[PDB]
Amino acid sequence: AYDMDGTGAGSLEPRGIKSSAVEKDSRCFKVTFVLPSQSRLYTFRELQNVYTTKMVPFSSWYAEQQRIQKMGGKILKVELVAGGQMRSVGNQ
Amino acid sequence: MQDIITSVINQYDLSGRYLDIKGINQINNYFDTGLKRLMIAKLINKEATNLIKEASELLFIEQPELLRPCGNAFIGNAYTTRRYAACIRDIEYYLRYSAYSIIAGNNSILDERVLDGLKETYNSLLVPIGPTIRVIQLLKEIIQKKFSTENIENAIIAEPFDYLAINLSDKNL
Amino acid sequence: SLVTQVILSADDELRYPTAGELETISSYLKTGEYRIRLISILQGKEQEIIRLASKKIFQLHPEYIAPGGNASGARQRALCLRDYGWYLRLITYAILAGDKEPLEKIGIIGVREMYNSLGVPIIGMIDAIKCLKEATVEVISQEEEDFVAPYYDYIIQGMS
Amino acid sequence: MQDAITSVINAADVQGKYLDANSVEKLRGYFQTGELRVRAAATIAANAATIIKEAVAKSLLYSDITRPGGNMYTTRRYAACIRDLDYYLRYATYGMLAGDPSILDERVLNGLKETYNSLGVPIGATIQAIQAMKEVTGSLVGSDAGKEMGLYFDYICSGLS
Amino acid sequence: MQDAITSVINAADVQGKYLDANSVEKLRGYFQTGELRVRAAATIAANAATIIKEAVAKSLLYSDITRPGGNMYTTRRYAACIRDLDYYLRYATYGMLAGDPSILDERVLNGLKETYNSLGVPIGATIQAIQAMKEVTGSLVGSDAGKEMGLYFDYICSGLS
Amino acid sequence: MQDAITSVINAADVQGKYLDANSVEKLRGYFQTGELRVRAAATIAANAATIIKEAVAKSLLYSDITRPGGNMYTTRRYAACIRDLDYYLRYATYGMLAGDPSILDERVLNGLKETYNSLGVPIGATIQAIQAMKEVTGSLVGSDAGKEMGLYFDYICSGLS
Amino acid sequence: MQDAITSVINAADVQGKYLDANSVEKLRGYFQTGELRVRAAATIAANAATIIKEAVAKSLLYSDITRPGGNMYTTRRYAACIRDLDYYLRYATYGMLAGDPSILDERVLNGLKETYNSLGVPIGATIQAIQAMKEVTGSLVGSDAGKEMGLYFDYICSGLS
Amino acid sequence: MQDAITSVINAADVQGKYLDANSVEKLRGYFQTGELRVRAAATIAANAATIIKEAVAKSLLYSDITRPGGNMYTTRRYAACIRDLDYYLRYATYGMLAGDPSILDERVLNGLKETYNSLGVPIGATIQAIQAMKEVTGSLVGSDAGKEMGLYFDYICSGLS
Amino acid sequence: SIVTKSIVNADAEARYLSPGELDRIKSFVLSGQRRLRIAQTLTENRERIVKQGGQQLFQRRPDVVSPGGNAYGEEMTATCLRDLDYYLRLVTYGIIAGDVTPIEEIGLVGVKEMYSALGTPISGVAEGIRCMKDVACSLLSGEDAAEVGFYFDYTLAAMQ
Amino acid sequence: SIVTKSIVNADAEARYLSPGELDRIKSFVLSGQRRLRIAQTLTENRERIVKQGGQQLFQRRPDVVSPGGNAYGEEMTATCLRDLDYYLRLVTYGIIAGDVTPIEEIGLVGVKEMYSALGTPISGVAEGIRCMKDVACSLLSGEDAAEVGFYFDYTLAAMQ
Amino acid sequence: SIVTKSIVNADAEARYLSPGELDRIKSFVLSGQRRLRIAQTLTENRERIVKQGGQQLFQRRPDVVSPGGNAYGEEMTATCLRDLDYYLRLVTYGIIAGDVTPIEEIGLVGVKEMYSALGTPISGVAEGIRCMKDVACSLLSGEDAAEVGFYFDYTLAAMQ
Ligand SMILES: CCC1=C(C)/C(=C/C2=NC(=C\c3[nH]c(/C=C4\NC(=O)[C@H](C)[C@H]4CC)c(C)c3CCC(=O)O)/C(CCC(=O)O)=C2C)NC1=O
Ligand SMILES: CCC1=C(C)/C(=C/C2=NC(=C\c3[nH]c(/C=C4\NC(=O)[C@H](C)[C@H]4CC)c(C)c3CCC(=O)O)/C(CCC(=O)O)=C2C)NC1=O
Ligand SMILES: CCC1=C(C)/C(=C/C2=NC(=C\c3[nH]c(/C=C4\NC(=O)[C@H](C)[C@H]4CC)c(C)c3CCC(=O)O)/C(CCC(=O)O)=C2C)NC1=O
Ligand SMILES: CCC1=C(C)/C(=C/C2=NC(=C\c3[nH]c(/C=C4\NC(=O)[C@H](C)[C@H]4CC)c(C)c3CCC(=O)O)/C(CCC(=O)O)=C2C)NC1=O
Ligand SMILES: CCC1=C(C)/C(=C/C2=NC(=C\c3[nH]c(/C=C4\NC(=O)[C@H](C)[C@H]4CC)c(C)c3CCC(=O)O)/C(CCC(=O)O)=C2C)NC1=O
Ligand SMILES: CCC1=C(C)/C(=C/C2=NC(=C\c3[nH]c(/C=C4\NC(=O)[C@H](C)[C@H]4CC)c(C)c3CCC(=O)O)/C(CCC(=O)O)=C2C)NC1=O
Ligand SMILES: CCC1=C(C)/C(=C/C2=NC(=C\c3[nH]c(/C=C4\NC(=O)[C@H](C)[C@H]4CC)c(C)c3CCC(=O)O)/C(CCC(=O)O)=C2C)NC1=O
């Protein structure tokens, strides 16, 4: 259902990224970042644009930002575009 | 995979008992040959290209039909440059994984990452399995010519290639 | 370094370094002064090592400096010797951080494309690093040769 | 990421130089403190949950931010913030082992202020919770390792402010 | 998204308060009009295609924008704009059922003016088409439901202008 | 098993129908080619051993599969594979006489790929031996009967692949 | 992407017009030079690696950017930049065949300056390498095709500056 | 998945029939027991963890399968089996609410025996744990709902055996 | 809220609300009055509910208030009663919303993480909620108590 | 079916049915009796509904039965009335199921492809369905006709 | 095992073991003898370690053996001492393997799920492991106790 159901260390499920997003959240970010591949010179695959601007769901923004930081990318701007701030009920 | 220490510890965990002197002797056996196992690994890393060139030449000298047209039977041999490169790639595969196995003191890496599914792939591609084992034990002899009088290193080298040869084989007898 | 490799493989799984990784770091950090002297020795003798490895590489491949080779001409030979110096410097960095990471990030990855771009044959490059290992082992101890050889063999395998 | 060894090797390599006496000085300096660093990292891995619990208890546990209207009122927000504090502690430990805060720049501080500003997370309370965690961590690991860890704690707080 | 009930509960919860007489006032107000809202939503779901057809026919069809050089000249553009009008009608119906325009802010108006400006879509003609759709919709659902629907239609037009 | 006549009668009976003009069309078609089918079946029965011998000689007789390590290396395996080829030829002849490949489905192809996979028999070499047998058989029986026989040979090869 | 034919057809279609004498003029102009364009594209496909090698040798091969500290020092960076030059040559060939630089706008220049600025790639050296490639390419394909190719080379350099 | 209503509608639709008196009989039968079904499903959702705990304690908690050598010795295996029991309870609740075991066929029993046989999981112990869970569940929900739940528990056990 | 959840579930599929969803919204707005009445009764009897639930919890779980227990001392017992009041308030919210969205979005998502970080046994909180459920259902009619315990049961299931 | 759809939507999230979904299932099983009554009335008046809808269609769309039209001739007109009977039966199914799943899974998915392959104008089928809707709603009460036309409107929207 | 983990980490990258990994394997096989000695000492003093750890646990956590506690009664106390013996055996395995792979693959993955399903407080198990750690480190030398507690600390961290 949601990512914060008690799973941590010593769980049966492997350790992973845990979003705090309420289930079926509809909050969304708008992010701009650069992510060079750093593996294209031994796989020899075609290039792609690495400069991206896109909307990312709130329930996936944390795992996305951590993946971007893992692979040497730089994050240039972040904006919450959809959803309120510090709203108790009503993020779904 | 499992090295020898892991497999001994797993055998003892299966009955839920602590390590006694028998398993400890088994572990000491590995700890006393570890350094020469590392010497063999370094030798293999120093001579990999030359060893595989020699093995391929000695294989193709006695199996000349491997370099000729497939015959109508669409057999995957080392006929053209494409197939030739693929076969040399496989020889490097065998050398690398048996070097891993020599360092681990065990053959579990072999049957998990090499043997499982190998014969299905070769049968679907129609790759010769006889000459494939032939080149493996050719590689074994070429490596053993570096350490000859030191018999313990001879057996330590003989282990992985002989496992591969006996497992790729069919059981005529 | 080895510390960086341990930290990276621990961070990719969202965990602290285990016991074995911590003792990897410990054992490496206790080896520091030995490596830090060995690179002193090797930096002392670079002007000699390069000089002898260069005559070896052209006794093996005299057609490289012959009329029509890639290194025929004063300007080209000077820069092959410069490449010798750069690779010896990279080897000092690799001996310092006790594993292949400098030799891989600089050097190995993308090297074949660069040399095919320039016109230097790759088999000549492999043989040149071999002659470099030859020249360096000829002028250092046996224990030091034991400590330095695997770094050369990593380059030889990374080019081929 | 680059540790102290990687940084020294890079400074030497970016000039075509061999590692001279100053590089040896820095390398010896790192090699002498490595064992203390490993000890501190082990001890911190041992007591992460208690460190976070005590820092939260001394910094923001009974303030008004945990009451209705506060940033961390509901259970979702409480869990999210304790996860954030765990992140900060783990990355400070990585930086202390490496002897170089570049991992904090690449994996933590990059775009963190902007995320917190878009979410509405109070920055001052976060910096104060990190300061309280610095106290407990230095307490648990002793003076030298506590100064080492506090270096990277203050680095995170400066990058966040 | 938050409806009238969610908004009242949030206003009460953000102060640590129990639902007092004013919250009961608003909640009763929503509960009294809910049945009319359901009736209007059903009727609008029944006649969406005819509403869009009639609004387009009365607002912009034989004009210069449908001729060569006009925005929606080609068949791609005509289909795209009628799909846009369908979006507007469906989301206005959602907002009318919920009694709260927050869904329009989160799912419709966020970055819409910028998209239309980058594409070159005329904003005035769009607002005019939405106004014509408001006429037909109020016509079909009667006075009270038409006032309710026109609230959110005007909300969309104000967010677009 | 069902031949062409059985299949037509079944298609008519499964609808409660009497045999109408289309059934008569198919039945006449089978009755016209029956005599050619009998001729071909007799000729194939005459020369089965030579057909198998020539197909094996042209397909896999001198390849590496007959050498040590190959599939048909020992005498047991050679005899087993020539028996398999005899099976394929006999059942293709049955199918050609019947004008219907259902016997191949019921008696040959059912669980054949799984048996060959468990034994380790190479499927590609088997399909190529069947293709070589198709050449010799069409050669010996002439063009029309060869196309008829090749229909069921290709049916076996498709069911095996 | 749109070529010369697509652009003419679009200009005629965006006015509800049939293709009149000026469209015929442009279409004949493209059809007369198409064969020269095909010849040049074939010759350029033949010698791409040598063109890139010679341009790099004449433009930045022995400068300080290839030494330690320079952008393209390590082997990764050298390979990346020669791949970039291959991209530029291939897309210039596409544009020359199409007779329209819109493919360069859609697939090459869109967000290229920003990527290079974030990476730290020197723009002036890149423009000079493209200029050197223009010399070799015009050299190899002759005067008319060289002017055609130089049109799109200069288009890329202007979009990059 | 299809519930009782879906099954009745399908039986009527597969014959081109309107819902006649027998369909009304079955539909009334389901509608009369729906409220009891909802009560039982709520109560089972309330006490799932305690039901699984008590079933495991009465069925296999102190047997030899939990000791070294047994099929659920290590902590991984214990957690995996309690997760399996949770799956069985949740899907039995779904089947009881739907009044139709087709969800058990589609989502649970399809390829379960083969997975357990490949893993080496003892089937008899699993069936006995499900039987013990049936006892506790019928106990907690009372006689009628317990018979309803036991129907699908026995369905799972028969599909597993 | 039921209306909100219907709207999102219809929004993902890019369709208007079908007549079933509108039927259910209608039935909800028609029952809103007794929903408000039940919320009234539960709301304004909060003191007795929290007190009697705290008693049944402390008699069923004497360890939590035993010397050293998590709720040991005056302040800790007051804080535990505060938590029980929090959950009663959330149950009233859920009763008026017609669905557990208010209860689950506030107080259930990440509750295990919070209570593990605080050192509180979650089973004690579940026991307290069950005791409050019995006390609160004692004050309602048959059908009202059935509908009200419907939410206590969900809160208990989520808090296992 | 409403029960089926609630179960799948709860199954994807790996959770039991929340009290809102159970509330809605309860309300559905409580209204099942008038659902069966309405299905009765629509079911057993099928002849008049199909006949009068066919009339209103043929008067509104004389081209389909004009010389050469798709439904031109005795057999084609009979087939068109057969189709209208199909859709009335599906509407009764949907009324008893409480949701358009029966109507949409049978007769709506891929209807445009089928009617385009047959050469039938889909707008004529929509007109026939609208005429049948008016005829059928004429025989019901106010609230019953409102709830019954709820499905005809969905069938018309899907058949645009 | 260190050898196994080095082999997998090198296998994912499709490369042979670099000289750093081989260096570390060499250092491990050289220290295997004192590893076996330490495992000896911990192994054959198991009775005192389990007994004295059980005491320190029961004095630090009297609730678990208080009337009704999870380990209340003769059988439950015996089972808890059995668990402590399990973990001591796993620690000996990890000491001989040179890495926490044996401890973590057996007894740590999914330990929270198991102990939550059994009703056992995981903090009590952590306390027992800490008490056993102190008792066991009391019988070793300085460097040996440091290296042995290295694994108890990991087991405690995983068991938070
Ligand atoms: C690795 C570096 C890194 C960090 C630190 C990080 C933080 C981060 N913190 C978040 C939320 C949050 N962070 C907090 C934190 C706090 N509230 C307070 O009052 C305190 C001052 C503070 C804790 C000390 C809270 C309450 C939220 C939830 C916001 C919400 O639900 O609206 C989110 C939104 C993701 C989600 O929970 O769904 C991210 C991505 N991401 C990263 O990649
Ligand atoms: C199809 C249009 C297109 C282009 C051109 C493109 C370029 C592009 N160039 C890149 C890097 C690069 N590009 C260069 C290029 C140069 N260095 C110099 O000194 C020279 C002046 C110049 C070559 C003439 C270098 C060195 C990098 C590597 C940067 C790094 O590794 O940090 C990267 C980062 C991706 C990666 O390598 O992982 C992209 C995406 N992408 C595109 O989609
Ligand atoms: C049709 C495209 C095609 C070609 C040409 C090809 C050649 C090819 N030449 C080979 C060897 C060889 N080829 C040659 C010689 C020569 N080769 C020449 O083209 C020259 C005429 C001559 C040198 C003057 C020699 C001496 C060997 C033995 C390999 C060695 O021991 O180095 C081999 C390795 C196996 C063998 O010994 O037969 C291949 C696969 N493969 C192909 O798919
Ligand atoms: C849910 C809220 C929402 C909206 C409204 C939305 C609109 C939206 N309208 C678009 C295009 C468009 N929109 C129109 C609309 C109009 N032309 C006119 O002259 C009229 C004034 C107007 C209709 C009333 C046209 C013609 C295009 C096509 C633009 C083009 O093909 O270049 C596109 C480009 C996507 C595409 O068609 O490929 C988006 C994303 N997206 C959203 O997420
Ligand atoms: C650290 C990784 C790395 C390498 C290796 C590197 C090489 C490099 N080699 C160069 C030249 C060169 N290097 C060679 C090398 C050789 N010829 C032979 O026959 C031998 C096999 C070999 C000497 C051992 C030659 C022939 C040239 C000049 C070729 C030309 O003039 O185009 C230049 C241009 C020098 C300048 O701009 O001032 C660079 C940058 N750069 C790097 O960053
Ligand atoms: C090798 C890794 C591994 C572990 C650790 C393991 C634990 C395990 N602990 C168990 C029980 C138990 N464990 C305890 C333990 C405790 N009670 C307390 O209060 C203390 C906090 C704690 C002792 C320190 C108790 C009381 C039971 C019995 C519970 C019952 O039957 O109700 C059981 C069920 C019965 C049995 O022992 O077979 C298992 C399988 N199994 C494994 O394979
Ligand atoms: C609205 C949803 C929500 C909840 C539930 C919530 C709980 C919450 N419980 C807390 C403490 C606490 N909660 C307890 C509770 C208990 N002790 C026991 O033994 C029992 C099992 C249990 C009572 C039933 C105790 C003792 C503390 C204080 C812990 C300490 O300070 O050491 C705290 C820290 C101090 C504070 O109250 O501000 C929070 C934030 N916050 C929320 O936003």
Tab-separated table of C-alpha atoms in Angstrom, chain F:
chain	number	residue	atom	x	y	z
F	1	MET	CA	-6.437	-40.270	-36.344
F	2	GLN	CA	-8.720	-38.765	-38.985
F	3	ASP	CA	-8.123	-38.664	-42.727
F	4	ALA	CA	-9.592	-36.191	-45.219
F	5	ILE	CA	-12.866	-38.123	-45.437
F	6	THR	CA	-13.157	-38.365	-41.652
F	7	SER	CA	-12.423	-34.651	-41.296
F	8	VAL	CA	-15.088	-33.686	-43.842
F	9	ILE	CA	-17.643	-36.005	-42.230
F	10	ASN	CA	-16.798	-34.574	-38.810
F	11	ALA	CA	-17.143	-30.978	-39.974
F	12	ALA	CA	-20.537	-31.846	-41.441
F	13	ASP	CA	-21.686	-33.883	-38.433
F	14	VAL	CA	-20.677	-31.301	-35.827
F	15	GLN	CA	-23.333	-29.001	-37.304
F	16	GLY	CA	-26.140	-31.508	-37.840
F	17	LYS	CA	-25.718	-30.961	-41.582
F	18	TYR	CA	-25.897	-33.251	-44.562
F	19	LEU	CA	-22.904	-33.345	-46.884
F	20	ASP	CA	-23.469	-30.336	-49.159
F	21	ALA	CA	-21.630	-29.120	-52.259
F	22	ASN	CA	-18.447	-28.007	-50.477
F	23	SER	CA	-18.046	-31.391	-48.790
F	24	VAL	CA	-18.508	-32.991	-52.214
F	25	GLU	CA	-15.820	-30.648	-53.545
F	26	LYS	CA	-13.292	-31.742	-50.924
F	27	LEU	CA	-14.256	-35.407	-51.247
F	28	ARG	CA	-13.786	-35.352	-55.019
F	29	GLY	CA	-10.450	-33.617	-54.504
F	30	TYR	CA	-9.240	-36.423	-52.261
F	31	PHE	CA	-10.629	-39.161	-54.516
F	32	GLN	CA	-8.821	-37.749	-57.556
F	33	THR	CA	-5.410	-37.780	-55.852
F	34	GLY	CA	-5.815	-41.102	-54.018
F	35	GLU	CA	-4.247	-43.159	-56.806
F	36	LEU	CA	-1.158	-40.945	-56.976
F	37	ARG	CA	-0.973	-41.244	-53.184
F	38	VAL	CA	-1.021	-45.053	-53.368
F	39	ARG	CA	1.691	-45.033	-56.045
F	40	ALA	CA	3.918	-42.780	-53.937
F	41	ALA	CA	3.361	-44.845	-50.785
F	42	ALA	CA	4.319	-48.041	-52.606
F	43	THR	CA	7.468	-46.479	-54.055
F	44	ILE	CA	8.473	-45.110	-50.643
F	45	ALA	CA	7.918	-48.481	-48.979
F	46	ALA	CA	10.181	-49.938	-51.663
F	47	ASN	CA	13.184	-47.700	-50.947
F	48	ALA	CA	13.025	-46.682	-47.279
F	49	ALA	CA	16.477	-47.954	-46.305
F	50	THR	CA	18.190	-46.297	-49.268
F	51	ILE	CA	16.341	-43.023	-48.627
F	52	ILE	CA	17.481	-42.956	-45.000
F	53	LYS	CA	21.029	-43.948	-45.968
F	54	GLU	CA	21.317	-41.186	-48.569
F	55	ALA	CA	19.770	-38.536	-46.309
F	56	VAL	CA	22.166	-39.421	-43.484
F	57	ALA	CA	25.091	-39.408	-45.918
F	58	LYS	CA	24.232	-35.946	-47.226
F	59	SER	CA	23.218	-34.360	-43.908
F	60	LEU	CA	25.267	-35.491	-40.906
F	61	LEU	CA	27.448	-38.451	-41.873
F	62	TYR	CA	30.847	-36.733	-41.802
F	63	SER	CA	30.086	-33.802	-39.500
F	64	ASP	CA	31.424	-33.515	-35.967
F	65	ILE	CA	28.298	-34.952	-34.311
F	66	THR	CA	29.390	-38.454	-35.380
F	67	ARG	CA	32.841	-37.978	-33.826
F	68	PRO	CA	33.677	-38.438	-30.127
F	69	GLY	CA	31.626	-36.004	-28.089
F	70	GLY	CA	28.916	-35.777	-30.735
F	71	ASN	CA	25.315	-36.915	-30.335
F	72	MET	CA	25.450	-40.012	-32.465
F	73	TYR	CA	28.979	-41.091	-31.573
F	74	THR	CA	28.689	-44.617	-30.170
F	75	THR	CA	26.975	-47.436	-32.060
F	76	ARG	CA	23.935	-47.337	-29.756
F	77	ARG	CA	23.317	-43.700	-30.658
F	78	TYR	CA	23.856	-44.194	-34.387
F	79	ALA	CA	21.354	-47.062	-34.429
F	80	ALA	CA	18.879	-45.072	-32.326
F	81	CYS	CA	18.980	-42.104	-34.684
F	82	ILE	CA	18.567	-44.159	-37.833
F	83	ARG	CA	15.571	-45.800	-36.145
F	84	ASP	CA	14.201	-42.310	-35.446
F	85	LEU	CA	14.571	-41.362	-39.110
F	86	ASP	CA	12.752	-44.554	-40.090
F	87	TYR	CA	9.921	-43.526	-37.743
F	88	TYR	CA	9.697	-40.099	-39.357
F	89	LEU	CA	9.596	-41.526	-42.881
F	90	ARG	CA	6.951	-44.138	-42.042
F	91	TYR	CA	4.682	-41.637	-40.301
F	92	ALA	CA	5.062	-39.104	-43.106
F	93	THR	CA	3.953	-41.856	-45.490
F	94	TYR	CA	0.922	-42.562	-43.287
F	95	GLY	CA	0.045	-38.871	-43.273
F	96	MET	CA	0.403	-38.640	-47.044
F	97	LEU	CA	-1.906	-41.621	-47.571
F	98	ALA	CA	-4.463	-40.207	-45.137
F	99	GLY	CA	-4.275	-36.651	-46.464
F	100	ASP	CA	-4.343	-35.361	-42.882
F	101	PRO	CA	-1.510	-34.680	-40.399
F	102	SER	CA	-3.515	-35.586	-37.275
F	103	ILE	CA	-1.690	-38.915	-36.961
F	104	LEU	CA	1.554	-36.958	-36.744
F	105	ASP	CA	0.113	-34.921	-33.873
F	106	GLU	CA	-1.210	-37.943	-32.008
F	107	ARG	CA	1.588	-40.471	-32.526
F	108	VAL	CA	4.768	-38.488	-33.245
F	109	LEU	CA	4.881	-34.851	-32.164
F	110	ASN	CA	3.162	-35.287	-28.787
F	111	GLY	CA	5.936	-34.806	-26.249
F	112	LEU	CA	8.779	-35.220	-28.737
F	113	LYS	CA	10.539	-31.898	-28.139
F	114	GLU	CA	10.518	-32.592	-24.402
F	115	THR	CA	11.996	-36.071	-24.848
F	116	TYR	CA	14.735	-34.726	-27.116
F	117	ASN	CA	15.488	-31.918	-24.663
F	118	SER	CA	15.744	-34.323	-21.727
F	119	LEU	CA	18.011	-36.637	-23.727
F	120	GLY	CA	20.145	-33.841	-25.159
F	121	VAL	CA	19.434	-34.628	-28.818
F	122	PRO	CA	20.224	-31.600	-31.044
F	123	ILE	CA	17.010	-30.357	-32.636
F	124	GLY	CA	18.626	-28.420	-35.476
F	125	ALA	CA	20.549	-31.427	-36.765
F	126	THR	CA	17.365	-33.514	-36.601
F	127	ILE	CA	15.418	-30.925	-38.598
F	128	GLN	CA	18.218	-30.807	-41.152
F	129	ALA	CA	18.234	-34.596	-41.491
F	130	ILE	CA	14.475	-34.518	-42.053
F	131	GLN	CA	14.976	-31.804	-44.677
F	132	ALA	CA	17.576	-33.947	-46.453
F	133	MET	CA	15.170	-36.901	-46.343
F	134	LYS	CA	12.526	-34.648	-47.924
F	135	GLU	CA	14.893	-33.996	-50.854
F	136	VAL	CA	15.565	-37.680	-51.539
F	137	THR	CA	11.914	-38.646	-51.109
F	138	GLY	CA	10.613	-35.978	-53.489
F	139	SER	CA	13.399	-36.984	-55.862
F	140	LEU	CA	12.314	-40.597	-55.859
F	141	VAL	CA	8.557	-40.062	-56.101
F	142	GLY	CA	8.431	-37.178	-58.577
F	143	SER	CA	7.145	-33.644	-58.307
F	144	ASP	CA	3.505	-33.968	-57.210
F	145	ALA	CA	4.008	-36.772	-54.690
F	146	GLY	CA	7.149	-34.981	-53.516
F	147	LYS	CA	5.184	-31.847	-52.719
F	148	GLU	CA	2.584	-33.979	-50.924
F	149	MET	CA	5.278	-35.710	-48.856
F	150	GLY	CA	7.103	-32.442	-48.222
F	151	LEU	CA	3.936	-31.009	-46.707
F	152	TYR	CA	4.092	-33.551	-43.874
F	153	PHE	CA	7.886	-33.413	-43.644
F	154	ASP	CA	7.620	-29.661	-43.049
F	155	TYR	CA	4.785	-30.323	-40.609
F	156	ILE	CA	7.091	-32.560	-38.565
F	157	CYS	CA	9.915	-30.010	-38.731
F	158	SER	CA	7.613	-27.199	-37.583
F	159	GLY	CA	6.248	-29.309	-34.742
F	160	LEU	CA	9.804	-30.141	-33.686
F	161	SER	CA	11.249	-26.622	-33.852
